[PDB]
Design a protein around this ligand. Structure first.
Ligand SMILES: *[C@@H]1O[C@H](CO[C@@H]2O[C@@H](C)[C@@H](O)[C@@H](O)[C@@H]2O)[C@@H](O[C@@H]2O[C@H](CO)[C@@H](O[C@@H]3O[C@H](CO)[C@@H](O)[C@H](O)[C@@H]3O)[C@H](O)[C@H]2NC(C)=O)[C@H](O)[C@H]1NC(C)=O
Ligand SMILES: *[C@@H]1O[C@H](CO)[C@@H](O[C@@H]2O[C@H](CO)[C@@H](O)[C@H](O)[C@H]2NC(C)=O)[C@H](O)[C@H]1NC(C)=O
Ligand code: FT8
Ligand code: FT8
Ligand code: FT8
Ligand code: CL
Ligand code: CL
Ligand code: ZN
Length: 586
């Protein structure tokens, strides 16, 4: 009967709110205070939430969702039938929870030490070395050292993690954990759709890569850069070479049109982490969207503690499943890169507030890419030179074609360079999960993809025992990655649509949607759906059509594509890395 199924979902919602709120609290308390005691409590709460998931999931599987008429009830029940790791026998469940905590903790406490010298943490110390050092050997020390300490230490856990996450997936009716993850998109054509989008971005990426490679050749020397080969992976300003904008100084298209040092401007003008989040809050409310609650300011961790606590620094946003308590945990540094991250995280909080009155089972983004995209959309407007000048972080840069191309390059170094990285991470993990890549070949297959998609090579040959994927947060934390590929594509579609709704004319990259209530309304209507409808409906509400499409990103960067093609042709660049086997001689 429809009536027993409606009652079931009402009971599930009531009880899940309580249990999920308790689990979220214990998880937060460990993430913001890594201790033996908080780990023990977290593992205990893990068994408590598993008992609830098993109880209600077992009930849900007694309903034949075929017979169910109401589609929202059918949708909730189908979801609750997936027990996730609560499908595991008790011993394997305890083992999985411990392995996950061990991997997460290992990553978040790893340090890289000089001999009889200081020990560096990833945030801020190694991040700053990668961003600012311009000495090959110092960058190599940080790049190799991080992999030696964090990556190699994850390897002992990863095969058993794979076994257990796959076992749970099979117990819930999937073939492996990658199948489970991909199912979040409810899109049978997902793999083909993502491949087509990746291929559309190749002209831009290959041209950007060749131009940056030439600039690296100029700085690091002809003996260290092959103009027809892959780029050494430690030279791009970022530990993972996933975003390249920190080497803007090495690649600036028009050096005669310099930009104000934004870090020094933020520091000289007294910006703090709290100010950064307040500015993001102001952008959301300028669109008519919701302010974060007072409680957010009391309870969030917006900077690394100075009091002796060890924490998980990697920035993240937290819903406590009570409609009131939402928090960010970020070890914020005062610079423009982290201002963008603060917007990314504030977008999650906005989504949490928008869907807070849906049943908890539907309190998720339309798909995981939508969740990661919202804050980045607003940050596209914040990042415009006009907006940054309004914040007194740049001088006036308008009315200058040189400044225009410089800005597009700054944006491409992050947004375009990230496309191949974000594509490859779960290409690797899906093949680990499906058994195509074994522990014998984890690292070799990672580097084959880093070459194939990003055109990068490791500066030091890898050795048996290396596990470089473990040195990237999302791997030991079991956070899917294709969401970020989707996000980077769709955030430009959203920007284009919101700019049109705001009445902007002229080139897309000049748009700033600040204060547009029409733009806010598009976003709010879509976010309020949560996970209640197939994601093409939310896509339609924002953009006027239902597909994912690279057209908006291509339009944004069209003037830079034209500039890059002319520049690369002038210098005779060979796009790609036809000398694909090249690696550094020294
Ligand atoms: C299929 O069932 C859904 C879900 O119904 C809700 O959840 C069930 C478990 C039961 O507890 C129901 O009693 C309960 O309504 C129906 O969706 C719901 O429809 C109602 C009626 O339009 C929506 O009410 C609105 O609520 C807002 C505030 O939240 C008011 O301001 C509005 O004026 C309006 O009254 C409700 O939001 C909506 N809920 C969800 C989660 O979608 C759905 O109508 C039903 N389908 C059919 C064809 O009957
Ligand atoms: C970090 O975690 C430790 C361990 O849970 C906290 O110390 C506990 O604090 C509670 C309440 O303050 C006491 O009831 C326990 O007896 C304490 N346990 C130990 C082993 O000291 C500590 O307060 C936490 N720090 C922060 C800043 O939250
Ligand atoms: O993405 C996430 N959670 C995903 C992880 C990848 S798989 C996916 C599909 C199958 C069911 C369930 C499973 O893990 O088994 N599930 C998840 O929880 C976290 S970051 C955000 C989120 C939280 C709650 C609900 C939805 C999203
Ligand atoms: O997404 C996240 N954090 C950001 C912070 C930096 S910006 C952003 C965009 C670029 C791609 C990706 C990157 O840095 O690898 N990324 C992030 O990881 C968090 S909300 C993911 C998470 C969710 C729940 C629990 C734990 C983590
Ligand atoms: O939300 C996530 N991961 C969830 C997936 C859905 S189930 C949930 C409840 C039971 C315990 C635990 C489990 O069984 O894996 N768990 C998860 O890890 C990831 S994406 C985000 C995240 C990562 C690290 C710390 C905090 C958040
Ligand atoms: Cl790597
Ligand atoms: Cl995903
Ligand atoms: Zn995020």
């Amino acid at each position: 009967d429809e009536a027993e199924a409606s009652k079931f979902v009402e009971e599930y919602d009531r009880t899940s709110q309580v249990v999920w709120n308790e689990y979220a609290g214990a998880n937060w308390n460990y993430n913001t205070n890594i201790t033996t005691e908080t780990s023990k409590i977290l593992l205990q709460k893990n068994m408590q939430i598993a008992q609830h998931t098993l109880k209600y999931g077992t009930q849900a599987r007694k309903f034949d969702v075929n017979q169910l008429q109401n589609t929202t009830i059918k949708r909730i029940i189908k979801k609750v039938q997936d027990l996730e790791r609560a499908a595991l026998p008790a011993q394997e469940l305890e083992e999985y929870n411990k392995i996950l905590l061990d991997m997460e903790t290992t990553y978040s406490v790893a340090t890289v030490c000089h001999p009889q010298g200081s020990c560096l943490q990833l945030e801020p110390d190694l991040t700053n070395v990668m961003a600012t050092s311009r000495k090959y050997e110092d960058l190599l020390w940080a790049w190799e050292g991080w992999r030696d300490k964090a990556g190699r230490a994850i390897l002992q856990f990863y095969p058993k993690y794979v076994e257990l996450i796959n076992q749970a997936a099979r117990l819930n009716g999937y073939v492996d954990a990658g199948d489970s993850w991909r199912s979040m998109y409810e899109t049978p054509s997902l793999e083909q759709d993502l491949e087509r989008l990746f291929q559309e971005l190749q002209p831009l990426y290959l041209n950007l890569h060749a131009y940056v490679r030439r600039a690296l050749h100029r700085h690091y020397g002809a003996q260290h850069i092959n103009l027809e080969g892959p780029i050494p992976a430690h030279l791009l300003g970022n530990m993972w070479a996933q975003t390249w904008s920190n080497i803007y100084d090495l690649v600036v298209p028009f050096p005669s049109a310099p930009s104000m040092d934004t870090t020094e401007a933020m520091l000289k003008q007294g910006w703090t982490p709290r100010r950064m989040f307040k500015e993001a809050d102001d952008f959301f409310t300028s669109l008519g969207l919701l302010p974060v609650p007072p409680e957010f300011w009391q309870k969030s961790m917006l900077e690394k503690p100075t009091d002796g606590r060890e924490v998980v620094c990697h920035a993240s946003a937290w819903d406590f499943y009570n409609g009131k308590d939402f928090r960010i945990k970020q070890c914020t540094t005062v610079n423009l890169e982290d201002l963008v991250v603060a917007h990314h995280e504030m977008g999650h909080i906005q989504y949490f507030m928008q869907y807070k009155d849906l049943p908890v089972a539907l309190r998720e983004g339309a798909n995981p890419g939508f969740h990661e995209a919202i804050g980045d959309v607003l940050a596209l407007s914040v990042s415009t030179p006009k907006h940054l000048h309004s914040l007194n972080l740049l001088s006036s840069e308008g009315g200058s074609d040189e400044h225009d191309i410089n800005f597009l390059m700054k944006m491409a170094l992050d947004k375009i360079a990230f496309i191949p990285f974000s594509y490859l991470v779960d290409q690797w993990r899906w093949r680990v999960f499906d058994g195509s890549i074994t522990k014998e070949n984890y690292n070799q297959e990672w580097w084959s993809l880093r070459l194939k998609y990003q055109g990068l090579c490791p500066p030091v040959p890898r050795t048996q025992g290396d596990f470089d994927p473990g040195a990237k947060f999302h791997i030991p934390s079991s956070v899917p990655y294709i969401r970020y590929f989707v996000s980077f594509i769709i955030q430009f579609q959203f920007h284009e649509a919101l700019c049109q709704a705001a009445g902007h004319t002229g080139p897309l990259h000049k748009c700033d949607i600040y204060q547009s209530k029409e733009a806010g309304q598009r976003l709010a209507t879509a976010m309020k759906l949560g996970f209640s409808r197939p994601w093409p409906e939310a896509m339609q509400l924002i953009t006027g059509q239902p597909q994912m499409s690279a057209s908006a990103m291509l339009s944004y960067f069209k003037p830079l594509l034209d500039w890059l093609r002319t520049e690369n042709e002038l210098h005779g660049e060979k796009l790609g890395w036809p000398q694909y086997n090249w690696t550094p001689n020294s």
